[PDB]
Amino acid sequence: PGQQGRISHTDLVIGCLVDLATGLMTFTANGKESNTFFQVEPNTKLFP
Amino acid sequence: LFAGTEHRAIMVDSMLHTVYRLSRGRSLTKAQRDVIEDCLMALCRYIRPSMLQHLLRRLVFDVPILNEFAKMPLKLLTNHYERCWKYYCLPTGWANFGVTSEEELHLTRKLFWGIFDSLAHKKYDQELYRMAMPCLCAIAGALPPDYVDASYSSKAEKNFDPRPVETLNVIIPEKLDSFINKFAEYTHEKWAFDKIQNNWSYGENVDEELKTHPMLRPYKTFSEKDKEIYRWPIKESLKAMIAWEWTIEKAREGEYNPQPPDLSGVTLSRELQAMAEQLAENYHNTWGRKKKQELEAKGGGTHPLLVPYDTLTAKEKARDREKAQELLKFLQMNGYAVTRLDTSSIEKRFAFGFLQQLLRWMDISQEFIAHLEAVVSSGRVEKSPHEQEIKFFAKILLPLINQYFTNHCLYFLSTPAKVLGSGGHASNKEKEMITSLFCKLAALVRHRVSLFGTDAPAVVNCLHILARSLDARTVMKSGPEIVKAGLRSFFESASEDIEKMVENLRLGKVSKGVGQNLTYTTVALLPVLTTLFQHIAQ
Secondary structure, three states: OOOOOOOOOOOOOOEEEEEOOOOEEEEEOOOOEEEEEEEOOOOOOOOO | OHHHOOOOHHHHHHHHHHHHHHHOOOOOOHHHHHHHHHHHHHHHHHOOOOOOHHHHHHHHHHHHHOOHHHHHHHHHHHHHHHHOHHHHHOOOOEOOOEOOOOHHHHHHHHHHHHHHHHHHHOOOOHHHHHHOOOOOHHHHHHOOOOOEOOOOOOOOOOOOOOOOOOOOOOOOOHHHHHHHHHHHHHHHHHHHHHHHHHOOOOOOOOEOOOOEOOOOOOHHHOOHHHHHHHHHHHHHHHHHHHHOOOEEEEOOOOOOOOOOOOOOOOOOOHHHHHHHHHHHHHHHHHHHHHHHHHHOOOOOOOOOOOOOOOOOOHHHHHHHHHHHHHHHHHHHHHOEEEEOOOOOHHHHEHHHHHHHHHHHHHHHHHHHHHHHHHHHHOOOOOOOOOHHHHHHHHHHHHHHHHHHHHHOHHHHHOOOOOOOOOOOOOOHHHHHHHHHHHHHHHHHHOOOHHHHHHHHHHHHHHHHHHHHHOOHHHHHHOOOHHHHHHHHHHHHHHHHHHHHHHHHHHOOOOOOHHHHHHHHHHHHHHHHHHHHHHHHHO
16 A cells, blocks of 8 residues: 555565366466455457 | 647757747847847747746746837747737637647736737837737737636736735744744654655665665654755745735634544635745745845846746746645634635626626726816917827727727627527626726717827727627617616717707808818718617627
8 A cells, every 4th residue: 555655666466377177267466465365267269 | 840749848949949039139230139039939939838837937038028029029928829820819710739728818818908908008109019019919819808817816916026914024934933943743654654655665784776865763863954944945835925915713612544534525616726836936035035045146047937837838837836725724723723706707707897897998998087177278288298198099099999899799799599609698788887997988079070180090990890799689788877868878879969950951051060060970970870770780
């Protein structure tokens, strides 16, 4: 939270991981696992 | 090549300033001065309207004096506004140049009015009236008739010298002094809050490159002097504030960050914003005063930025206005209410005031013509002291009327149901005032064409244009009985003149009043009446 000192010199890096066999999608904030996850059916096409 | 200097507008403005200064230069021959003037004009042609804003402010300063050097700038501005009129007038504006910032519009209003008043007060000079014969007409065409300036108040102020009134002979409240003391303490606390927002933690260690001011110590350690030295700006400012006939009163008589954010959300009235503007302007005039006191040692090259705080660009306002707002909010919740017209937007419009001045000049025309015939009947006065007023009227006002109303005929005829013009429709008051002006001018010219002489063709052409501009339906349906009666009087007077004329053609009269009636009819009335009938039918 940066309602104070909102400007951040640091650059954010969001990482997206997908397991094609399990159809599972997960995210990392700066190497820290995020709570959000998705599950997709087989044959799904996904674009970054 | 200067056309696309958007990335170097700063250097362009510096160059324009330098060339303007060199034009305003002693020890320069006529040919030299002409070279500088030509270069400045040519650059202004190709330069974007936005860039010239600063030079327009400086010229708003200089030109209203109407001194010898005011000649060329009148031309520079005439050409600039004639070329770039759609940039100011139309909401869309020219493509690739944009639209006015509303500060240029405020400056344009001020320029128009200053030149107008100065030239009215000046004695007739053919050369000067000729330089303003290309006239404020370009400025008026650039200005929208419906332009409403955020602040419409008498400046009551005058190169530039601010003169404070010193009340130090009176006492000052020590309760007040302590109040500003605690306010400065709390402002130190907000300053620490601001460093925390900046994310830099003020530090015990001393270091210039962190910009962390080592000074930050327990408040108790401070040296007594620096306290009142740092105070003295605040004390001086508040002192000037209570000095300039602004009262502080108690609203309700007597008898670990900061949890509450001091936010701008609070609503403020237009007049309270005007008072904050005036207070910020007074703080900036005490500023410019100490600045000038420091600078007068060198005595030359006065800083151009030093100008009235409201006149200069609104960007600099934010800071002083914010301090004034937070202060007034603070003293309001405490209870120290600070107390120093409701003009409608319609009154604030440029066209409204322009028509007001035109009607006032029409009344002046009536009065000095009356005095003129009174002296002609007996006790003739050859002097004619209203000479300057007559010259102003004929040479300036009539051409201005013609051009302005020719350009903006649709705005006056426009109604919300049907909008002939691209943008805007005139108010009912403006319609009434133009109708009143037309009727007054008709009465003025009536039986006095010989008095007007060479200006009578101008009078009749202005009458034609005004007639085309009139929206009679609105006035007759919902309009003051004064204006309705004036228009009815015009019609009945025209009828009477025509019957008298047809009788004179019957030749029952011997064959002076008959010549006056015939010439007035033919030259002025019958054409104007024809034009009005055509406009009504259309």
